CSV table of N, CA and C and ligand atoms in Angstrom, one decimal:
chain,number,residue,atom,x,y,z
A,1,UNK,N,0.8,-1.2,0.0
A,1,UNK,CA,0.0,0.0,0.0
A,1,UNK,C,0.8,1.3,0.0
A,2,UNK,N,0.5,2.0,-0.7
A,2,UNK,CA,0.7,3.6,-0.8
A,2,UNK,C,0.6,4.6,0.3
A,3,UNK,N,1.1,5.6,0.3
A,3,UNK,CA,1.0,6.9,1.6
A,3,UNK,C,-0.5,6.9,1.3
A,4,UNK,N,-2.0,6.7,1.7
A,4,UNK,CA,-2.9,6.9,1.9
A,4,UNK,C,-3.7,7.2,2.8
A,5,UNK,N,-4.1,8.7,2.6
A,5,UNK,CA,-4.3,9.6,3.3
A,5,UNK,C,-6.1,9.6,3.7
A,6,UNK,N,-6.4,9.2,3.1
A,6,UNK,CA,-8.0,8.5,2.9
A,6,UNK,C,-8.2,8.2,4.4
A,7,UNK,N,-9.4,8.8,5.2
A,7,UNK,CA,-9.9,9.1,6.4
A,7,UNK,C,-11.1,7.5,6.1
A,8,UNK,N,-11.4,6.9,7.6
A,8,UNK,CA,-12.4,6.3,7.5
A,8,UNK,C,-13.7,7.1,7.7
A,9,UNK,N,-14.4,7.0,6.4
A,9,UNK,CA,-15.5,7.8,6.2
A,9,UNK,C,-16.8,6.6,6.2
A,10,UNK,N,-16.4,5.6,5.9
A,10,UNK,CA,-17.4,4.9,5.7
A,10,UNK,C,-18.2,4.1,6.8
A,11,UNK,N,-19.1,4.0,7.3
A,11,UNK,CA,-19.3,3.5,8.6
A,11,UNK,C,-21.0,4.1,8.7
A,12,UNK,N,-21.7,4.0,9.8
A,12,UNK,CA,-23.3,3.9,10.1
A,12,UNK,C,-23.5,5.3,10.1
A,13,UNK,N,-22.6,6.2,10.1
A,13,UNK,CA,-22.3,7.7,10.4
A,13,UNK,C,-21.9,8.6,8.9
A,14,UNK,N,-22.8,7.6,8.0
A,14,UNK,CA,-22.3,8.6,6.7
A,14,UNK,C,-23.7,9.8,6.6
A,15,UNK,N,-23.5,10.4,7.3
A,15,UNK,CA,-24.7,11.8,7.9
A,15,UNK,C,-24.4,12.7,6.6
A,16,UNK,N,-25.0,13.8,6.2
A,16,UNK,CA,-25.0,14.9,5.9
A,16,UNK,C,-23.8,15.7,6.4
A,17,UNK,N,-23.8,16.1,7.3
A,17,UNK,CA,-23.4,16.9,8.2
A,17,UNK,C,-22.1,16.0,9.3
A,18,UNK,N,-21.4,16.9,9.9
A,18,UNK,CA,-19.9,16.2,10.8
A,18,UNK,C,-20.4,16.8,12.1
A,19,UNK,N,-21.1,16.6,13.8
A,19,UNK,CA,-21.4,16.8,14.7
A,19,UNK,C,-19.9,17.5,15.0
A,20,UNK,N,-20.1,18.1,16.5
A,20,UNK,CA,-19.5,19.0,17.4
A,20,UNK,C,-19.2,17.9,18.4
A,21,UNK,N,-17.4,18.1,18.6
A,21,UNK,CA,-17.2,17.8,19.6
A,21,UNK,C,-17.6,17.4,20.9
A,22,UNK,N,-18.5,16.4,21.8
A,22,UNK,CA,-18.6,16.5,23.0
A,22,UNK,C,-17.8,17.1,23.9
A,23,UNK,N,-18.0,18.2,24.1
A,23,UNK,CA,-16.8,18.6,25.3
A,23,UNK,C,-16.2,18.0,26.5
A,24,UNK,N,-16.9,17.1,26.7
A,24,UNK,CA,-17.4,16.0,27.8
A,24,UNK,C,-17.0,15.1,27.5
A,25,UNK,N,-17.0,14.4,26.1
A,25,UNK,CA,-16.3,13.2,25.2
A,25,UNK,C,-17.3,12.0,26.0
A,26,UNK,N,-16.8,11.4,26.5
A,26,UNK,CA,-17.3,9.9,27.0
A,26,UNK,C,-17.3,10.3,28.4
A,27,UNK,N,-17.7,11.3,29.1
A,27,UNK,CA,-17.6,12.1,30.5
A,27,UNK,C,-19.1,12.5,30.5
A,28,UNK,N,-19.1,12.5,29.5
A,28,UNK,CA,-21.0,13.6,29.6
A,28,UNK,C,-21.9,11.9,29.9
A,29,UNK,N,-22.8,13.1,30.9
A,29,UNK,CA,-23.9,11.9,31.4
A,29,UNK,C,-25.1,11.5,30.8
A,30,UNK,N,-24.9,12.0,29.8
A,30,UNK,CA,-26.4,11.7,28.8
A,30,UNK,C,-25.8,10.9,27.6
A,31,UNK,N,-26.7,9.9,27.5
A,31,UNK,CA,-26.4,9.0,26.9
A,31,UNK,C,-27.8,8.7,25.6
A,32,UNK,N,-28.7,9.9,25.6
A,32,UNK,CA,-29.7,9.7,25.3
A,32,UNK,C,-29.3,10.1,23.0
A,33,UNK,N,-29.5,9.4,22.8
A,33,UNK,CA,-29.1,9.7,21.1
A,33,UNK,C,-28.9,10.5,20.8
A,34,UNK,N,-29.8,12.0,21.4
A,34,UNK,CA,-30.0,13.1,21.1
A,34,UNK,C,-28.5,14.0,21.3
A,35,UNK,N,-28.4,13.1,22.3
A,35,UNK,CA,-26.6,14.2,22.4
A,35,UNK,C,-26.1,13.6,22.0
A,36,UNK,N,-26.0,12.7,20.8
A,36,UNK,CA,-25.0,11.8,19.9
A,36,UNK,C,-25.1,12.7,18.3
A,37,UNK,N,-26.5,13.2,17.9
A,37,UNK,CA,-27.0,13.6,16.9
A,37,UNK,C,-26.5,14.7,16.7
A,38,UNK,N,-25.7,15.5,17.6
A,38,UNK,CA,-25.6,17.1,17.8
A,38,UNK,C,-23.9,16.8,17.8
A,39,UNK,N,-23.3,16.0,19.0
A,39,UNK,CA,-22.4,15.7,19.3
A,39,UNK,C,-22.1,14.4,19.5
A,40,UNK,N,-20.4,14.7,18.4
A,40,UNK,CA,-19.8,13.6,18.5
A,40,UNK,C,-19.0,13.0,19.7
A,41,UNK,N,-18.7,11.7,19.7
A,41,UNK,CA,-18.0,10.8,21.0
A,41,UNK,C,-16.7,10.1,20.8
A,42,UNK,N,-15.9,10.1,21.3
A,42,UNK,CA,-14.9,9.3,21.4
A,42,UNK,C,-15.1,8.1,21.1
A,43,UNK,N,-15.0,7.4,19.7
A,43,UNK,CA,-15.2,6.5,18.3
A,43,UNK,C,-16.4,6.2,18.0
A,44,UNK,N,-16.5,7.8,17.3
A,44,UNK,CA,-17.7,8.0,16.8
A,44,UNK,C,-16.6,7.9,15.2
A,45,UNK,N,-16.9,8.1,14.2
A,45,UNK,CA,-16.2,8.5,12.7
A,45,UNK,C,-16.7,10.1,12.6
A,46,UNK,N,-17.1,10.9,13.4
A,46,UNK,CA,-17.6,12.6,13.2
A,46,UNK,C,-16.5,12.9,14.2
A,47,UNK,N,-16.0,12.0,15.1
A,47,UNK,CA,-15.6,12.9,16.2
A,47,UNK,C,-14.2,13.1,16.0
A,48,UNK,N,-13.4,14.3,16.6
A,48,UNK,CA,-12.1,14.8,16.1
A,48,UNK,C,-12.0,15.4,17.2
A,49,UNK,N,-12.4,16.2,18.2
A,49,UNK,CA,-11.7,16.4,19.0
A,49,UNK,C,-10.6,17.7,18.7
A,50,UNK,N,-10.5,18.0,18.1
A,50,UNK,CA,-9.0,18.7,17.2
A,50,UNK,C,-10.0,20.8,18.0
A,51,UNK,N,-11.6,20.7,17.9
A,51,UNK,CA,-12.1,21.7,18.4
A,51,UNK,C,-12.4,22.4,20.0
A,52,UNK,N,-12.1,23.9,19.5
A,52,UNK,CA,-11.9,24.6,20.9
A,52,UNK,C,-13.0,23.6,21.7
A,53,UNK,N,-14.1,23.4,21.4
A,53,UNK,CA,-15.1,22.9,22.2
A,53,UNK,C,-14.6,21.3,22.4
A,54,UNK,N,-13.9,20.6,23.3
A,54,UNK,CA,-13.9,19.0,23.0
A,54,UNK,C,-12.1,18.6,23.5
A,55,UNK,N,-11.4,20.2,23.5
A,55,UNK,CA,-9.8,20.2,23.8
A,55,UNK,C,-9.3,21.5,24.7
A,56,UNK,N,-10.0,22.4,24.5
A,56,UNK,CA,-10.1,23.3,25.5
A,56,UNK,C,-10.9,25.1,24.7
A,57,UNK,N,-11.3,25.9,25.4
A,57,UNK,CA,-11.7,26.9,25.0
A,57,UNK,C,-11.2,28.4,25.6
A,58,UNK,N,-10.9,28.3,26.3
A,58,UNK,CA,-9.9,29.1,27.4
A,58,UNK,C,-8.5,29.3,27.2
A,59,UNK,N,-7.6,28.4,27.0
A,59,UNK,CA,-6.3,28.6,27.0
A,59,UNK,C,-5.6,29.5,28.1
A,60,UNK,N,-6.0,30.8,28.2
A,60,UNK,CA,-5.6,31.2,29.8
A,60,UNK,C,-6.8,32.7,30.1
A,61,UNK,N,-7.8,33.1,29.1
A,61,UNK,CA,-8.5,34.4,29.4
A,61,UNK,C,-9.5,34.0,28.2
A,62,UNK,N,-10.8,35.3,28.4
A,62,UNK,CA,-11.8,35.2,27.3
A,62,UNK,C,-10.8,35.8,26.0
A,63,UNK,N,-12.0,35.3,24.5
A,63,UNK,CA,-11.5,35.8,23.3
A,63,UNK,C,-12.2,36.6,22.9
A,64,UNK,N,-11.1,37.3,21.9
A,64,UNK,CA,-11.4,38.8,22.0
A,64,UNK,C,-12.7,38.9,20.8
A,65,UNK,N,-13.7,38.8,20.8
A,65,UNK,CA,-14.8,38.5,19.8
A,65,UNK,C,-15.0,39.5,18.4
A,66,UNK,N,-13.9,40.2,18.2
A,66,UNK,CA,-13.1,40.4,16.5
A,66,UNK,C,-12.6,39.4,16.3
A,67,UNK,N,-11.9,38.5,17.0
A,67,UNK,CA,-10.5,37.7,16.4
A,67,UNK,C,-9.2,38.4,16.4
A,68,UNK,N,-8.8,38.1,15.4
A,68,UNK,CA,-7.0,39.1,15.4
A,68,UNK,C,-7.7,40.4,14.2
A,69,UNK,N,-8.7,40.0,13.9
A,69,UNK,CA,-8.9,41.6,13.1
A,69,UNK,C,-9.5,42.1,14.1
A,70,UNK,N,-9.3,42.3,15.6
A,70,UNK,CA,-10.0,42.7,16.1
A,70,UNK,C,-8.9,44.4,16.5
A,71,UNK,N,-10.2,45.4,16.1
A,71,UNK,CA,-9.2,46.6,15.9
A,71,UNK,C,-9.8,47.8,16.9
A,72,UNK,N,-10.0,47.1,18.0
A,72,UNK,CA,-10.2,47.5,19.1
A,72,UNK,C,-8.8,48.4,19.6
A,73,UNK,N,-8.6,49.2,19.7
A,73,UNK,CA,-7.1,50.4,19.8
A,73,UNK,C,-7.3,50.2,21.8
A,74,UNK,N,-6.6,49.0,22.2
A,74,UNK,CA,-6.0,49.5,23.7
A,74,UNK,C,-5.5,48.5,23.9
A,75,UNK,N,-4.3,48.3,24.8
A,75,UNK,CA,-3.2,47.3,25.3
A,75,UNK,C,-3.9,46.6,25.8
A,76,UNK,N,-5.1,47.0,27.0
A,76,UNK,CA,-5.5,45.9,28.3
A,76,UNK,C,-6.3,45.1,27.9
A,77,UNK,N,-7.6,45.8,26.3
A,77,UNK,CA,-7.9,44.7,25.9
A,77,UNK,C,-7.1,43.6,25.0
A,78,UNK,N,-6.4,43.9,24.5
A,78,UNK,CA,-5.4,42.8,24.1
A,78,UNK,C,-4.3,42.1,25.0
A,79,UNK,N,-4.9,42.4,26.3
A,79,UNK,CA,-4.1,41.8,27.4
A,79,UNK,C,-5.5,40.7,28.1
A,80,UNK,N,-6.6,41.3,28.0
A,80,UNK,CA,-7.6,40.6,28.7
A,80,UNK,C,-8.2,39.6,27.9
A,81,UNK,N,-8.4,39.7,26.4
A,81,UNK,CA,-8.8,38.8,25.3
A,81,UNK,C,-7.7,38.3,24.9
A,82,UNK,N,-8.6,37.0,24.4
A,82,UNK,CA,-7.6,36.2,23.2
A,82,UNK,C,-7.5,36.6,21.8
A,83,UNK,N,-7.2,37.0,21.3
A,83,UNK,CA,-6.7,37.7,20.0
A,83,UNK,C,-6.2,36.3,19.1
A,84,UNK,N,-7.1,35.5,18.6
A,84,UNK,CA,-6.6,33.8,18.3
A,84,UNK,C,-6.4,34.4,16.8
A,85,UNK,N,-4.9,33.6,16.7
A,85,UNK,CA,-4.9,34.1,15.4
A,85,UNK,C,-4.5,32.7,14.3
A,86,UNK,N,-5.1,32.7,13.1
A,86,UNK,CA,-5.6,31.3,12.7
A,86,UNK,C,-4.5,30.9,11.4
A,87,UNK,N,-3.9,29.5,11.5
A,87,UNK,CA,-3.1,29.4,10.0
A,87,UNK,C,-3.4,29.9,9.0
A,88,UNK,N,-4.7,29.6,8.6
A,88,UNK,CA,-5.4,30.0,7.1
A,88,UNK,C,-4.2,29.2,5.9
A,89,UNK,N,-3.6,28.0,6.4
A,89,UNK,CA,-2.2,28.1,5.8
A,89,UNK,C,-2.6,26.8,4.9
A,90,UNK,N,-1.6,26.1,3.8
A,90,UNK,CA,-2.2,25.6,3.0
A,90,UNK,C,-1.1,24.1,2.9
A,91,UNK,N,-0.8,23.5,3.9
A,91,UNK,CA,0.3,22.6,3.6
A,91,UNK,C,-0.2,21.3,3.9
B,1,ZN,ZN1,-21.3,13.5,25.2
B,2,ZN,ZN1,-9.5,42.5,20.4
């Protein structure tokens, strides 16, 4: 076999749509489908984990709700917010 990079996509979970991280993962107490529908689980084939919601959201203060275009002109709020600033990169 070849470097293949081919994700398992195929499985009971070929949905429309890719759910949200459980932030909770296999921690959350509901077990009821409905938080399965919305949110993915630790081996689910939706679930990735790789999002602020599911790995952390915080890092160490709130974010600054521009982003890094956020052109808010003062030190403390770029001291108080997170100013997340994103690859956008293509490798
Ligand atoms: Zn859950
Ligand atoms: Zn800001």
């Amino acid at each position: 076999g070849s470097k293949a990079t081919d994700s398992v996509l195929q499985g009971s979970e070929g949905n429309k749509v890719k759910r949200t991280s459980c932030m909770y993962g296999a921690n959350c107490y509901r077990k009821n489908p409905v938080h399965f529908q919305h949110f993915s689980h630790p081996g689910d084939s939706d679930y990735g984990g790789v999002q602020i919601v599911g790995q952390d959201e915080t890092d160490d203060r709130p974010e600054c709700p521009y982003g890094p275009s956020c052109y808010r002109k003062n030190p403390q709020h770029k001291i108080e917010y997170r100013h997340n600033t994103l690859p956008v990169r293509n490798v």
